[PDB]
Amino acid sequence: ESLSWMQTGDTLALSGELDQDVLLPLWEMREEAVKGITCIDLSRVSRVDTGGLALLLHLIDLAKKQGNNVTLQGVNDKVYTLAKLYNLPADVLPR
Amino acid sequence: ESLSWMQTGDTLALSGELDQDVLLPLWEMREEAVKGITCIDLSRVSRVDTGGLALLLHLIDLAKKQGNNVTLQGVNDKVYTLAKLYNLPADVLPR
Amino acid sequence: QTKKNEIWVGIFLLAALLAALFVCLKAA
Amino acid sequence: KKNEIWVGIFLLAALLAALFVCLKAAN
Amino acid sequence: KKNEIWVGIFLLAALLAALFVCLKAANV
Amino acid sequence: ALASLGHKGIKTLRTFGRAGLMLFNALVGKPEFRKHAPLLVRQLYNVGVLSMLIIVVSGVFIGMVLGLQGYLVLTTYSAETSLGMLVALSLLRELGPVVAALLFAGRAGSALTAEIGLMRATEQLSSMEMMAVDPLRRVISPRFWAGVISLPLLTVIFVAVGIWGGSLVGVSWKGIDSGFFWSAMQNAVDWRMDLVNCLIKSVVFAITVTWISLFNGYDAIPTSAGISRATTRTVVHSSLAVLGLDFVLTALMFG
Amino acid sequence: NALASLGHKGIKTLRTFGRAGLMLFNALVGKPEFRKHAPLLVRQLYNVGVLSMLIIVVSGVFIGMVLGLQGYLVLTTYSAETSLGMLVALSLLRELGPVVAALLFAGRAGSALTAEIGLMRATEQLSSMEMMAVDPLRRVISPRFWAGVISLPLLTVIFVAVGIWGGSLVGVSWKGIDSGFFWSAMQNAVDWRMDLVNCLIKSVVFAITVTWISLFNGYDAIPTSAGISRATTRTVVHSSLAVLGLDFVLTALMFG
Amino acid sequence: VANLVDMRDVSFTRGNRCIFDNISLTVPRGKITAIMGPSGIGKTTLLRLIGGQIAPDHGEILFDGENIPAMSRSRLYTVRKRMSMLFQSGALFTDMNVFDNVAYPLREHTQLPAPLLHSTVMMKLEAVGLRGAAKLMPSELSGGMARRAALARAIALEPDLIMFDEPFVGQDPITMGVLVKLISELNSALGVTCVVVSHDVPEVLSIADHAWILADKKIVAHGSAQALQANPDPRVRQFLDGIADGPVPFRYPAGDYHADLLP
Amino acid sequence: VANLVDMRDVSFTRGNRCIFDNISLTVPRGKITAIMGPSGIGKTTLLRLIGGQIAPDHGEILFDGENIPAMSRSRLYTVRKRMSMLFQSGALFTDMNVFDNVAYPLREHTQLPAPLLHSTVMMKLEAVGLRGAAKLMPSELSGGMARRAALARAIALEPDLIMFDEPFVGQDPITMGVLVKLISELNSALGVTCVVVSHDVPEVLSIADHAWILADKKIVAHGSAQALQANPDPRVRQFLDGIADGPVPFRYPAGDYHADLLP
């Protein structure tokens, strides 16, 4: 029941769960939280519901709008099956 | 397209078809047409619809109310299957 | 459930007649 | 139907009393 | 369709003509 | 503006045409009334008898309100003995027929539309057509004649009850002399022509109200939402038609 | 037979009154009552008020005309035809205005609300709203109730101010009364604050009663399509009876 | 003739929406003839066309060799004593009990004495199986008992074409079995010609002798039950097995995804 | 706990009619659980009991170990964010398009920024398959698309118990297949716990993991799909195959025959 991001250079890393209650603390300052990164870590994230996927897609889009092509890392396979349920193309959510 | 009954002693015999248009000429005088009979012939009857079965049941009942137990004769098997559709007991329509 | 309708329509017509008589007798 | 009939008779008596109270106005 | 429209025009014409002869019998 | 205004105009003309066609096809017939008595009696029960309590209870109250508002005006000119004339004329001329028509459109003018729309929803009209029974002659004309026969009677009841309510207020409560009230009322205004005019405008209101009701119930979209849009339309259009026809008939029959 | 039937009907009427009271009470107790409810109340003012405006305007015109005719014919026998404006204005501001506005509002908008809520209850929209923790009494009953209460007095004001103009059309323009006498006689002599305030008071009472009866009958109807059409008629009937009864009571209280 | 009803190039459109586009089907005499298809396609209008309640735009509807839309009104009302619809809502008259509903056609068209009429109505109510409910109002009936009473009414005048209108829609397997047994044994005993317009394939194809799968405003395939349970066509096979995705798009036409996802 | 919903000796009667008489069923967590039975038995009340909309007369309804009828109103409204019904009529709000209907629970309970909310609603509408109809009013929708949009709405707040209320009733096999695929893949991906109260046996038993056949006001049998397709009991077997005549009388209770035939 906590969300805390700590980018180590160009590798943003999220922590704790990720759902509708804690989306705001990261969405308020999404830009500086995504500036100059190429690897969005998710290994330290336990649960990702639909709102978490929406935030992840918006972060990936905001990073793609800065040139650096984004690569995800440590993504739980539950996120992958829950995203394939929504039929997300490989363009918006790079596997 | 005609109904004409001619009882030969105690054996009533019907003729022609038997349906809703020609039920009245026999129902008007059902009593004298059934008085003192024990065998209702039907071999000279081509088609018998539901109204014909109703008239036959009422005639058999009126004859049973005079003692003489009624026996049908020359009954077309189509009458029998169309009566078994309506699930008529052997009490009212003696086979 | 039909003699009910008959007697009620009769009562309604009788009430209409009594009303018409009341008016036409307080009319002249 | 006992309490129902009692309530009905009480309502009839109350309606009669209301008619009598309206009769306290005039006639 | 055409017959319905024609009956409608005729009925509206008859209604407005009745109302017109009425109002001409009303003002004067 | 003109893009949709002409479409609306032709749609309204087609609606009037459908209404006229329904009426003409439901009224022409010689064997109409006989063998239909068990239908017309039931319809007189549904339309008339069930719509009698509202008429009586509203006539009492309108008579009382007329009595109060006429006494408070006539007591200034020492003419409170003409309260009977005032109440009787205001009921026999405008209030009686118009209010009876409005309450009839409310209670029995919407019930007919709802009933016929529901009969069209469960496909009872099509099922009646499938067995060679013309519905316009079997289900429309009994209701039409029930309404036409039943409104001018509810109007007479409404009048003869409002007059009595005005008598309650004026004679009993306020204290006017009953002799002056009734005698003043009967000789001065209750001529045959006032009653005849009341009945004439009541019959016209009956015709228009029951026609609008039957048509809106017969032309409604069968869905359970199109029926409720037809009951409200029935009430609205019938109130508007009643008031307009009332103004016209007043301008005709009273100079 | 009478004792059992009368007792059962009395108990059923007591139960209906209790359920209506509970519905209104639970619908009219809340903190966010008017904030965050602006679009709801605006849409409900449109469905109840604006759509029920053409009938009110036209009926006002026609009743003003009928009053003008039937007042001219009465006053012309005493040469008091110049008091026709006073007569029309007072008859509208006292009885015809509020009562007829309430009757037409219960017919047009009092039945639409009942039908709409009954249909909302038939399609299980109210149960589907309760199932997502959104109190329907606070979401669909309160906006419609406040829309009706806010929208009937305005319709009554429009109805009056239009019937007065219709009476002027009949008396001044057609019958030929002096316009100056008409207006001046009417304005100076009788339209004081008390005549108006009473019109608004009885209009607000009629609003409360009509919209409450309509909402309750729409909220208590049997969900079937034959229970809705049976609740619309009950709405119209009960609303007309309540309007006329409360009108008699309010007249007896405020005038004599 | 062997084709009791014989449509030929009939096309019907309401508004601007082409409901039927040049369809033509033949109903053999004495055999059940299903007309299946997707729901919402308006396949119940196909019965109102045979009933003459609405007229088509082209084509002809030959009933026993007699073109129906060209007939007059009296001739139509005379022919309609041979047809009988069965609407899915029963279409029972709510102001009279089941007995009066069943007796309405007899009491209207035939001159039968009251005892004979009562006996006939009781016989038919027993044939369907609702004789015990001969005094219940239509409101007190269930959803399947209403259709059974309406079927008892439909066989009153001894017709020769009973056009069923989705009789199995929304009912447990018990009532479906009861209805399919009734339809089968009525087609067997009375020799009537049924036309079952439904979309409950596993139950409808249990009786039908020549089905007509109707999709895409026209007729896609037709044949016996076996000739349909083995027809290798994408649309027909999808409709028959209930395959979710196929020639009918499982996904509503949407278009792009990124613009809707990231506006 | 493994039983998400756990009824125990619950009995509910309206009027004087005993609807349920001492029934007790357990809904496992993460698995579909059908509740079948004859139509008109009122088996949809079994869902309103779990939803707390109506209170039973005896017994207890344990939701995740918490007795529901004993809870307060605020606690009930807090728990109801975990359940989600799906009424057979869709129950869509007719005064707003599909997008607003799906966004209503999100826009009501969660504080999501407008872009995130739009993205989430579009994702869910794509999951169901109605993303192309995100602008249509509920009246412009078909009969199955309405239920699909209502299902998209039911999964908005990420619940853990979706109580379906006869989703397959009266629909062609195409829409039945679409709905059963959606239900199966939602139970698979999201891990929600479905409770399908229906009476369309051949489609319901295709997904259900532990069915509960409910007849005669009580529970007659229960088990897996195989344990029901092989249970030798007259009532259960009649209901499963759709046998017309059996322990449920095909003929309405009538009595004598001669007195009705010859009065």
Scanning H218-257 for CB atoms below 8 A from A yields 257
Structure tokens at F7: 């479409």
Chain A residue with CA closest to I123: the answer is A86
* C-beta neighbour count of G183 within 10 angstroms: 15
Q: Provide the 10 A C-beta neighbour count for residue B27.
A: 18
Please answer whether residues H127 and B87 qualify as being in contact, where contact means their C-beta atoms are separated by less than 8 angstroms.
yes
Task: Write the DSSP string, F121-149.
Answer: HTTHHHHHHHTT--HIIIIIHHHHHHHHH
Question: Counting one residue from F and one from G, how many pairs have CB atoms under 8 Å apart?
Answer: 124
- Write out I32-69 in H/E/C secondary structure: CCCCCCCCCCCCCHHHHHHCCCCCCCEEEEEECCEECC
Chains D and B touch (3+ CB pairs under 8 A): no
Chains adjacent to A (≥3 CB pairs closer than 8 angstroms): H, I
> Are the C-beta atoms of residues I82 and I159 closer than 8 Å to each other?
yes
- Contact list in D for residue F168 (CB cut-off 8 A) is none
Name the burial class of residue E24, with classes exposed (0-12), middle (13-18) and buried (19+) by CB atoms within 10 angstroms of its CB.
Answer: exposed
CB pair distance less than 8 Å for B86 and H124? yes
Within 10 Å of residue H227's Cβ, how many Cβ atoms?
12
Beta strands H218-223 and H211-215, pairing class:
antiparallel
Residue H21 phi/psi, 5° resolution?
-130, 90
Query: Distance (Å, rounded) from C-alpha A56 to C-alpha A48?
Result: 10
Which is nearest to F127 in space by CA: H102, H135, H128, H192? Answer: H102
H254 Cβ contact list (under 8 Å, min separation 6): H260, I126, I131, I132
Q: Which residue is closest to H262 within chain A, CA to CA?
A: A58
CB F144 within 8 A of CB C3: no
Q: Which residue, F80, F102, G61, G98, is CA-closest to G69? A: G61
- F170 close to F184: Cβ distance less than 8 angstroms: no
Token output for H126: 């027993």
Q: Which two tokens stand for residue B11?
A: 């054996």
The answer to the question of residue A92 being in a domain is no
Distance, CA of A51 to CA of I116 (rounded, Å): 7
φ, ψ for residue I42, nearest 5 deg:
75, 35
CA distance F145 to H235: 55
DSSP string, H221-251: EEE-HHHHTT---HHHHHHHHT-SSSSS-SS
Query: Which residues, in sequence order, are CB contacts of H220 under 8 Å at separation 6+?
Result: H213, H214, H233, H235, H236
Taking an 8 Å cut-off on Cβ atoms, the answer to whether F248 and E22 are in contact is: yes
Residue I200: its H or E element: none
C-alpha to C-alpha distance for F54 and F67, rounded to whole angstroms: 20
Q: Which two tokens stand for residue F136?
A: 């316009």
Buried b (16+ CB within 10 A) or exposed e, G22-55: ebbeebeeeeeeeeebeebbeebbebbbeebbeb
- CA–CA gap between residue G21 and residue G54 (Å, rounded): 33
A95 located within any domain? no
Question: Which residues, including other chains, have CB under 8 Å from residue H189's CB and lie 6 or more apart?
Answer: B81, B82, B84, B85
Our CA-based measurement puts residue G135 at a distance from the nearest CA of chain I, in whole angstroms, of 9
Nearest by CB to I116, from A54, A86, A88: name it: A54
Contact assessment for residue H84 and residue H162, using Cβ atoms and an 8 Å cutoff:
yes
Can you tell me the distance from the alpha carbon of H41 to that of I85, in angstroms, rounded to the nearest whole number?
Answer: 29
Residues of H in contact with F123 (CB under 8 A): 87, 89, 91
**CA-closest candidate to residue I209, choices I30, I8, I5:** I30
Interface of G with D in 10-69 (CB under 8 A): 10-11
Q: Provide the shortest C-alpha distance from residue B52 to chain I (in Å).
A: 14
I261 touches chain H (CB under 8 A): yes
Residue A92 sits at the chain H interface (C-beta within 8 Å): yes
Looking at chain G, which subunits does it touch, using at least 3 CB pairs closer than 8 Å as the criterion? Answer: D, F, I
Structure tokens at H215: 């999709």
Q: Is F25 on the interface with H (CB under 8 A)?
A: no
In a domain, B24, yes or no: yes
Question: Strand, helix or coil at H120?
Answer: helix
Q: Is I215 helix (H, G, I), strand (E, B) or coil?
A: strand
Neighbours of F191 (CB within 10 A): 13
Q: Is residue A91 part of a domain?
A: no
Question: What's the rounded Cα separation, in Å, for the pair A27 and H64?
Answer: 74
Name the residue in chain F with its Cα closest to that of G57.
F240
Chain I residue numbers with beta carbons less than 8 Å from the beta carbon of G127 are 48, 53, 85, 87, 91
Are H108 and F133 within 8 A, CB to CB? yes
H61 vs D6, G181, H41, H69, H75, CA distance in Å? 69, 76, 20, 7, 15
Residues of H in contact with I172 (CB under 8 A): 37-39, 199, 239, 242
> Containing H/E element for B36?
none
Distance of CA H192 to the CA centre of its chain: 14
CB-CB under 8 Å, D9 with G10: no
Q: Which chains touch E (3 or more CB pairs under 8 A)?
A: F
Q: Is B80 on the interface with H (CB under 8 A)?
A: no
Residue B49 lies in a domain: yes
Pairwise CB contact (< 8 Å): I244 & H178: yes
Amino acid at site A27: W
Domain containing residue A29: CATH number:
3.30.750.24
| Interchain CB distance below 8 Å, E5 and F21 | no
Q: Do chains A and G touch (3 or more CB pairs under 8 A)?
A: no
For the CA atoms of H103, H104, H109, H115, what is the dihedral angle to 10 degrees? 30
B92 part of a folded domain = no
Q: Under an 8 A CB cutoff, do G3 and D11 touch?
A: no
Nearest to F186 among C12, C15, C26 (CB): C26
Buried b (16+ CB within 10 A) or exposed e, F207-242: bbbbbbbbbbbbbbeeebbebbbbbbbbbbbbbbbb
Chain centroid, CA F47 distance in Å: 11
Cα–Cα distance, I99 to I103 (Å, whole number): 6
- Tell how strand H218-223 and strand I3-14 pair up: unpaired
**Are chains D and E in touch, 3+ Cβ pairs below 8 Å?**
no
Q: Which residue has the tokens 């109805």?
A: G159
User: Do B24 and B13 meet the contact criterion of CB atoms below 8 Å apart?
Assistant: no
- What is the Cα–Cα distance from F154 to F143, expressed in whole angstroms? 16
Calculate helix-pair angle for G97-122, G193-219, nearest 10 degrees: 20
Distance CA F209, CA F225 (A): 22
Q: Which domain holds residue A40?
A: 6-86
- I50–H contact, CB cutoff 8 A: no
Residues in chain H within 8 Å Cβ distance of I144? 39
Residue B51 lies in a domain: yes
Report angle CA G101, G57, G230 to the nearest 5 degrees.
50
Which residues in chain D are closer than 8 Å to F67, comparing Cβ atoms? none
CA H208 to CA H196: how far, in whole Å?
8
> Running DSSP on this structure, what letter comes out for residue F238?
H
- Report the relative pairing of strands B16-18 and B45-48 from DSSP bridges: parallel
Looking at the complex, report in whole angstroms how far the Cα of residue H128 sits from the nearest Cα belonging to chain I: 8
Side chain identity at residue G6, one-letter code: L
Whether the CB of F7 is below 8 Å from some CB of chain C: the reply is no
Residues 56-115 of H with CB under 8 A from B: 110-113, 115
Q: Does G108 touch chain F (CB under 8 A)?
A: yes
Q: Any idea what DSSP says for residue H96?
A: S
Domains and CATH numbers, chain I: 3-261 (3.40.50.300)
Q: How far is G192 from E13, CA to CA, in rounded Å? A: 47
Query: Which experimental technique did the depositors report for determining this structure?
Result: cryo-EM
Detail the DSSP E strand segments found in H160-239: 161-165, 194-197, 211-215, 218-223
Pair G104, G55: CB distance under 8 Å:
yes
Q: How far, in Å, are G39, H21, I58 from residue G207 at the CA level?
A: 21, 55, 44
Most F CBs within 10 Å, among G244, G246, G247, G249, to test the F interface: G244
Which one of F49, F92, F155 would you mutate to disrupt binding with C, by most C Cβ within 10 Å of its Cβ?
Answer: F49
Chains contacting B (3 or more CB pairs within 8 Å):
H, I
Helix locations, chain F, DSSP H:
2-27, 37-43, 53-74, 83-90, 96-121, 124-130, 135, 141-167, 178-188, 192-218, 224-253
Q: Classify the phi-psi angles of I28: left when phi > 0, otherwise alpha if psi is within -120 to 50, otherwise beta.
A: beta
Question: How far, in Å, CA of A54 to CA of A62, rounded?
Answer: 12
Which of F150, F153, F182 best probes binding to C when mutated, by most C CB atoms within 10 angstroms? F153
d(CA H157, CA H109): 8
G32 in I contact zone (CB under 8 Å): no
Amino acid at H132: G
Are G51 and G109 contacting, i.e. CB atoms less than 8 angstroms apart? yes
Distance CA F50, CA F55 (A): 10
Q: Following DSSP, what letter does each residue of A15-56 receive, concatenated? A: -EEESTTSSHHHHTTHHHHHTT-SEEE-TTEEEE-HHHHHHH
Query: Judging by DSSP bridges, how do beta strands A71-73 and A39-41 pair with one another?
Result: parallel
Residues 6+ apart with CB under 8 A from H63: H4, H5, H6, H50, H79, H82, H83, H161
Which residue of H lies nearest to A87 if distances are taken between CA atoms? H257
Give the 3-state secondary structure of residue I219: strand
The answer to whether F92 and F115 are in contact (CB under 8 A) is: no
Q: Residue H5: in which H helix or E strand, if any?
A: strand H3-14
3-state secondary structure chain G: CHHHHHHHHHHHHHHHHHHHHHHHHHHCCCCCCCCCCHHHHHHHHHHHCHHHCHHHHHHHHHHHHHHHHHHHHHHCCCCCHHHHHHHHHHHHHHHHHHHHHHHHHHHHHHHHHHHHHHHHHHCCHHHHHHCCCCCHHHHHHHHHHHHHHHHHHHHHHHHHHHHHHHHHHHHHHHHCCCHHHHHHHHHHHCCCHHHHHHHHHHHHHHHHHHHHHHHHHHHCCCCCHHHHHHHHHHHHHHHHHHHHHHHHHHHHHHCC
Instruction: Determine, yes or no, domain membership for A94.
Output: no
Which residues, other chains included, contact C22 with Cβ-Cβ below 8 Å and sequence gap of 6+? F160, F163, F164
Residues of chain I positioned with their CB less than 8 A from the CB of H171:
39
From residue F185, alpha-carbon distances to F66, F86, F90, G194 in Å are 14, 8, 12, 33
Give me the DSSP letters along I231-258.
Answer: ---HHHHHHHHT-SSSSS-SS-S---SH
In this complex, how many residue pairs, one in chain B and one in chain H, have their CB atoms less than 8 Å apart?
46
- Size of chain B, expressed as the number of residues it contains: 95
Which candidate from I123, I177, I201 shows the least CB-CB separation from H173?
Answer: I201
Chain H contact set for F122 (CB, 8 A): 87, 89-92, 94
Residue B46 structure tokens: 């081509």
Q: How many domains does chain B have?
A: 1
Residues 153-212 of F with CB under 8 A from D: 172-173, 175
Distance CA B77, CA B95 (A): 10
